[model samples]
Target: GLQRFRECELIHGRWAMLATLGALTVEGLTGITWQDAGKVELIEGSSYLGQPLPFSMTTLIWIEVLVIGYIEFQRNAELDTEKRLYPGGTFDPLGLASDPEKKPILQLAEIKHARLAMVGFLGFAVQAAVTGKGPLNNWVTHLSDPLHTTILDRFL
Candidate 1:
């Protein structure tokens, strides 16, 4: 058996990621924006990493997640179609993408990459929330602001 169950898992996981990231993006742009405007400024300890930078980081997270999810979905869909079309073996004359034995390895790679992207997105989200309202709201203010004077400072 081809264990076709993985096909649906792959597809569903891809779309679910899209939905979550999309909602997060909308919330950051609309809900969070309004919340910032109406509510009291929590991270107003000092102007180190200002409010705008956290929100911008959130937006960046949204974009990166969306792109990674879409690309992963496309890759899985193509692999699924190829597997179904040529079940037992592949007909890759140029030995490029039709290797049947490499299918499972590729699938695992996709899963690992998806997990990594999610880790990144969640980390960014936590960063935004903590710097927005969590304990870091004031704690980050204690640090000295780094200025770019030398090349090392610029790189850092």
Candidate 2:
């Protein structure tokens, strides 16, 4: 009962994640080159929270939804059941992914039904990029970005 055609998208991310994990583990164990190791660390350490360019929390959450979707329901109907039961009957997140051959924009009603969950992510990214990278790393770090310094300054 898998809607194999509609959204194998989630599976794609899960697959890539799994593959990346496997590759990292194997390479790390075997001793990868410094450049490769640095790249891995950069990817691993870089904020899942990037700017508007892409690869931000939005991207991560989007990937998480896809991964969860793939794992939870093998088909779209099952996915829809959860949506229909949700407080609001809306779950189509990727509705904006264009299909040029077909009508590009969705109906206004559909747009209303679909939520912009990514807005928060975009906001965070904007803050990090423009407002300045204050304390995205931690609440404490954020609290002290303006003046607090040193390893022993404590404030709450």
Candidate 3:
């Protein structure tokens, strides 16, 4: 169904946008490589070992559960899910856009941005898979070693 497809896929574009933002911001701010940030280990071999998180991981898990869980599911019960799900009413803080005719253009603008974000975000994932580096770090690498570090140097 087109309705269900919209429900599912619009959510994916938002996820792509968030993940792309995180891919840059995580490394940019925390100085943690986006690829390396998720490499938590609980190892027991010669060189592998594990670390403990503050308290249990369940703390953050349940926190996310309460926050995203309630917030997302509550939308399921909201009146006019279609309009509320895609809107600039409550989301529009300063009452900026409220035109019936131009609303379609605004929505099309978002659709373009969302789709572009997704394609670019997927490109990031493929680049990360091929190079094992985040995009910002790659740019820095590209700058630091202008002659040596190159696509041909790694892949060709």
Candidate 4:
């Protein structure tokens, strides 16, 4: 049987939230190694800081954003629908345009764009994996020399 919308929302919401947290946590912790090339060394070898899981890690982040964004978008739609059906009430606390019936939720076009963005990020990840070269790698190299710079690292 198909899952209820709320159930799907809960499932996707938790996973997406955890995925985002996981990415951020790992990125922050692992990114520390890039800060000080002198104190820390790359386990793989002497490679560009950007070369470290640029594709896969970034793809995880992109996926998390897309999924979580989709969940929020759906939630907005449901809220809008509820407002339309229930009419006026004290439900709206923010008094914003999205106060139920007043504003439109995320459109299909926007949702499509979100999905497209996820795919694009995935493609970039694959390219990064295959070529071992990308804007991120370039930027990371520009930020610091993994062999020399310590405090000058871009993201620690």
Candidate 5:
């Protein structure tokens, strides 16, 4: 019923897409969970900011001040003039979005996939947070030992 519900969907979906991508890539390639991968092993410094083990909330502020903050301020003004959810200008660099005639259905398709990815990544996040387990760790265990690590074990 909201006129702008789709707007939040677009932004949040993009974030989860990147989050899931990074988590999978880091763990799958490096054999570490996203949380573990964040751990500074060989770095010279002990702790960068605070007790989330460095990379603290202070450095976190720069992302909003310099990167995302700058970008979002621009996005807000652009939306006022453009009056559209999707933009097709320099934003469409290679014309992947620019050169579409059936843009309406494509919009539908994009949002559909985006929403699905958002929820799926949320599932992955909850799995790790609740079980204190990594995605790859679970899968490898499932493969390496099917005896005790039965498919039935994942139920609880």
Candidate 6:
């Protein structure tokens, strides 16, 4: 059972990682850097851009981490264990305003509000630390053109 669960988790992680890489590459090519990465030297004109793009991509993956962390924390602490195992409630509510027409909506609203507050507060802090500079260089200039292309340079 654990093996099966782990396998599913790995598959999901791989797919999500691929999607993240695709999005990150698009962002980099378009000159869209996060606040921290944008502050790096080559982009910032401060020192020297080291590997800023890669670091920014790495930091974006933390978005998945933050969401998963919120879910896990909610499951452990805020979730109603009793209702999860065996819901105990009247088939019908007995109140003047309790029409049961909005019970499900109310329940969903509560969960949404709580999750938003929890995730938003934590995510702001986590994202602030991760989107920083270390190193950055143009991929075409650094790796690709030297290996295969013959657009301009032919010198030794």
In candidate 4, what are the lDDT values of residues 1-156, reduced to their tens digit? 333553444344445444434433434545632223323333443334344443344565688899999976755576454443333346446545454454555333434454555454454445445545543444465477665434345355
TM-score of each: 0.30, 0.24, 0.73, 0.29, 0.71, 0.23
Which pairs clash inside model 5?
A: none
* Tens-digit lDDT track of model 5 for 3-98: 467677787887877887777776776556777654543242333222234444456566558997777777777555234477667767776666
Question: Model 2: clashing residue pairs?
Answer: 135-142
Off by over 4 Å in 5: 41-64, 80-84, 140-156
CA lDDT, every model vs. true structure: 0.48, 0.41, 0.70, 0.46, 0.68, 0.43
lDDT of 3 by residue, 1-156 (tens): 677677666777778878888888877876655576655321221111233445334565678889899988767766576664475577777654576687778777767777877997888888889987788888788899988887788665
Cα-based lDDT at residue 52, candidate 1: 40
- Going through the candidates in the order shown, the clash numbers are 0, 1, 0, 0, 0, 6
Q: lDDT of candidate 1?
A: 0.48
Top candidate (TM-score): 3
Query: Which candidate should be chosen as best, given lDDT against the real structure?
Result: 3
Which of the predicted structures, 2 or 3, would earn the higher TM-score when compared with the native? Answer: 3
Which residue runs of candidate 1 sit more than 4 Å off their true CA positions?
1-96, 133-156
RMSD of 2: 16.4
Residue 59, model 2, lDDT:
71
Candidate 4 local distance difference test against the native? 0.46
Candidate 3 clash pair list? none
Question: How displaced is residue 128 in candidate 1, in Å?
Answer: 0.9
Which is the winner by TM-score between candidate 1 and candidate 3? 3
